[PDB]
Amino acid sequence: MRLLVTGGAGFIGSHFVRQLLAGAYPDVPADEVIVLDSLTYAGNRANLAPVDADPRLRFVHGDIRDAGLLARELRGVDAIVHFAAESHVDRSIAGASVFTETNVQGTQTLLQCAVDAGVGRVVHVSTDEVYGSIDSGSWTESSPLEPNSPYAASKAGSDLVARAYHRTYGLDVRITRCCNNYGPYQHPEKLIPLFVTNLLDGGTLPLYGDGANVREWVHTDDHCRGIALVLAGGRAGEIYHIGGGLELTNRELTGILLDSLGADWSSVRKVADRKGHDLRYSLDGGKIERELGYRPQVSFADGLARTVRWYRENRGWWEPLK
Amino acid sequence: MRLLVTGGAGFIGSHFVRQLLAGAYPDVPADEVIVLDSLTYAGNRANLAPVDADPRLRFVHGDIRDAGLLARELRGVDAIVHFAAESHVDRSIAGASVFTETNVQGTQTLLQCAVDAGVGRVVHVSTDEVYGSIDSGSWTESSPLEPNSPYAASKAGSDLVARAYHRTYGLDVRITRCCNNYGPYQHPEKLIPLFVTNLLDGGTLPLYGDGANVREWVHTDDHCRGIALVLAGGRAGEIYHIGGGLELTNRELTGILLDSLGADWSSVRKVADRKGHDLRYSLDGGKIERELGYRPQVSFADGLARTVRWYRENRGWWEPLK
Ligand SMILES: NC(=O)c1ccc[n+]([C@@H]2O[C@H](COP(=O)([O-])OP(=O)(O)OC[C@H]3O[C@@H](n4cnc5c(N)ncnc54)[C@H](O)[C@@H]3O)[C@@H](O)[C@H]2O)c1
Numbered sequence: 323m324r325l326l327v328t329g330g331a332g333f334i335g336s337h338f339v340r341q342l343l344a345g346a347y348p349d350v351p352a353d354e355v356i357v358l359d360s361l362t363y364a365g366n367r368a369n370l371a372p373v374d375a376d377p378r379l380r381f382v383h384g385d386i387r388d389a390g391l392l393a394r395e396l397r398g399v400d401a402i403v404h405f406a407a408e409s410h411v412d413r414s415i416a417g418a419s420v421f422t423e424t425n426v427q428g429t430q431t432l433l434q435c436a437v438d439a440g441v442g443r444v445v446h447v448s449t450d451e452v453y454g455s456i457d458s459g460s461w462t463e464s465s466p467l468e469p470n471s472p473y474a475a476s477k478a479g480s481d482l483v484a485r486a487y488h489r490t491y492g493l494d495v496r497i498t499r500c501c502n503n504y505g506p507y508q509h510p511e512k513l514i515p516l517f518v519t520n521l522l523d524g525g526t527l528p529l530y531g532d533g534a535n536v537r538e539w540v541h542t543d544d545h546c547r548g549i550a551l552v553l554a555g556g557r558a559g560e561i562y563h564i565g566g567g568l569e570l571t572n573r574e575l576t577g578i579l580l581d582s583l584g585a586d587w588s589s590v591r592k593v594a595d596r597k598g599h600d601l602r603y604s605l606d607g608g609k610i611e612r613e614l615g616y617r618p619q620v621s622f623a624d625g626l627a628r629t630v631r632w633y634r635e636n637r638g639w640w641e642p643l644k
Numbered sequence: 645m646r647l648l649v650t651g652g653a654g655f656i657g658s659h660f661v662r663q664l665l666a667g668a669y670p671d672v673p674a675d676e677v678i679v680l681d682s683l684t685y686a687g688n689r690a691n692l693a694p695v696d697a698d699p700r701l702r703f704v705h706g707d708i709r710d711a712g713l714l715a716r717e718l719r720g721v722d723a724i725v726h727f728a729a730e731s732h733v734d735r736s737i738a739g740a741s742v743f744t745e746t747n748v749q750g751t752q753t754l755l756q757c758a759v760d761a762g763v764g765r766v767v768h769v770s771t772d773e774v775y776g777s778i779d780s781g782s783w784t785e786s787s788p789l790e791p792n793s794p795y796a797a798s799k800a801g802s803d804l805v806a807r808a809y810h811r812t813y814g815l816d817v818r819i820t821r822c823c824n825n826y827g828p829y830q831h832p833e834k835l836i837p838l839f840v841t842n843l844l845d846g847g848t849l850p851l852y853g854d855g856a857n858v859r860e861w862v863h864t865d866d867h868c869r870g871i872a873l874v875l876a877g878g879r880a881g882e883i884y885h886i887g888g889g890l891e892l893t894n895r896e897l898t899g900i901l902l903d904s905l906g907a908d909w910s911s912v913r914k915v916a917d918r919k920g921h922d923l924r925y926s927l928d929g930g931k932i933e934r935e936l937g938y939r940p941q942v943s944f945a946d947g948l949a950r951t952v953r954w955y956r957e958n959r960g961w962w963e964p965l966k
Pocket residue numbers: 328329330331332333334335358359360361362363364365366384385386387404405406407408409410424428447448449450477499500501502503504509
């Protein structure tokens with residue numbers, strides 16, 4: 323019952339850690355949790371402050387690319403949940419190399435070390451962006467990889483590395499793919515926290531192009547619960563989509579955020595569109611539901627409300643990040 | 645008309661270079677050819693000896709991972725044909741990291757530099773192994789990526805990086821995928837030259853498992869001619885399969901090689917099978933034929949005969965490599 327969580331000081335990773343330690347995943351027993359995080363601009367020790375008193379938690383400031391470190395930290399580890407990654411599309415367009423480096427090479431290093439340490443199973447956390455764009459309908463686990471951005475191409479490359487580790491060495495690795503997450507502790511470079519915090523700072527909102535692009539949104543709590551279900555009961559080598567997604571154009575979402583804050587359209591500015599911007603993401607989550615029983619439980623309206631309030635009450639957390 | 649060929653001191657790359665300089669590709673005019681090769685165990689200056697007197701040829705001993713070097717060597721380059729890679733499956737199973745490093749990160753570096761240098765078009769040379777294994781039938785350009793070995797996963801990751809460079813930055817990159825190549829100057833770690841040279845050395849042949857695995861074989865001359873057709877007339881962002889392949893089980897091929905050398909079955913030994921060994925590869929090459937007019941012109945029987953004779957007459961080349 324010794325687990326290692328990479329990227330556990332980031333947004334999603336920290337939520338998984340806080341929840342696991344809170345006992346929200348009865349089927350994943352945690353006797354000892356090691357968090358490995360290199361603390362890039364996106365990692366934040368404060369995301370784990372609510373649990374730093376936990377005796378079961380060991381925090382390791384280090385890199386997934388460090389084979390030396392992993393060979394030692396993975397001794398006796400039964401399972402790994404891998405969240406560590408460069409995760410922002412805009413950064414990837416501005417400076418792609420670090421995406422290959424952390425995402426593809428880091429994943430290769432981590433999995434090789436897992437094989438050398440005899441780790442039981444690994445959950446590789448991935449994204450819907452690997453599928454490109456979809457005008458109508460939703461993608462299934464058999465949809466083809468047609469990444470458009472360097473970030474998406476790096477995440478797809480890392481999913482291929484996972485497949486090879488399972489096929490060649492017999493590593494029990496499971497892959498999850500999810501839509502856009504939202505919730506407390508999300509870095510303010512991401513759409514929702516960026517727009518909410520700009521508003522709180524009395525600023526404008528940079529809406530790309532026309533705002534017609536479509537994304538599906540899931541509360542990170544639901545995403546993390548699906549990851550725990552896969553950890554506990556998925557099958558080696560399988561891919562699972564974690565749905566939930568309420569589908570919105572960015573325009574309509576912008577409107578919901580303005581309302582949630584008492585603001586108006588005059589706060590929005592239309593900016594030049596993102597290079598190669600994906601028009602629409604939509605994931606079909608029937609497989610995980612039929613196989614593992616997963617269904618989202620946080621409605622957008624409630625989740626979003628709690629999220630906005632969190633930002634309103636935590637300027638001390640986000641201010642420094644901007 | 646300035647071209648840069650990465651991996652041009654390797655097997656396929658050197659054949660493309662010798663042919664281009666020989667004028668076999670009238671539609672690809674070569675005023676200046678730069679070859680960039682890091683001379684790993686697989687690169688060999690002697691592969692280019694037949695053309696070192698060519699004034700149009702500039703040989704650069706360097707790495708695709710060296711952004712410094714590329715930023716300068718790519719100045720004024722109109723097109724790149726990218727062959728540089730770690731190419732042996734067995735090496736990839738024994739030591740996977742270098743595959744991610746050269747194949748995925750090296751490709752990312754090269755393409756970024758191509759975008760920064762304003763390079764007109766690039767041909768990214770890939771493989772049928774990205775598709776996994778296929779029991780019956782042949783794969784098309786829309787077949788899904790299901791790599792099984794670290795080598796295949798690294799080549800698929802590099803194909804995804806190519807797609808993203810085209811989708812995000814507008815880079816005119818074309819991808820080719822081919823079956824197993826054979827011919828003069830192939831390194832002796834590969835099946836055919838390994839078996840031919842073992843026989844010439846009076847040794848035995850390590851046939852994996854039962855030898856039932858199936859591969860399609862094409863003479864490198866045909867492969868290179870299809871690459872030149874894609875360079876000259878393919879379309880940005882497209883994938884092209886380069887077929888030819890006469891499909892054989894390794895058992896049947898072994899039998900053909902024994903005969904070509906006057907040997908017999910007593911020279912063959914059955915060895916433990918390769919981890920995650922792909923059972924069968926088969927590529928459909930209708931697209932390149934219908935779109936670009938490509939059809940293989942070297943029959944297996946003649947190509948193979950010339951190849952075996954080449955090994956018989958070039959012990960000075962291969963001996964040192966073993
Ligand atoms: N946020 C989303 O909407 C979304 C959707 C689906 C999938 N994902 C995937 O979920 C994962 C977590 O995403 P997130 O939004 O929490 O990201 P994030 O940017 O908030 O956090 C990433 C974390 O990884 C750490 N990290 C980065 N490089 C590292 C390295 N080399 N070694 C160790 N630690 C390293 C960072 O310090 C940080 O704590 C990523 O794999 C992402 O691709 C995210």
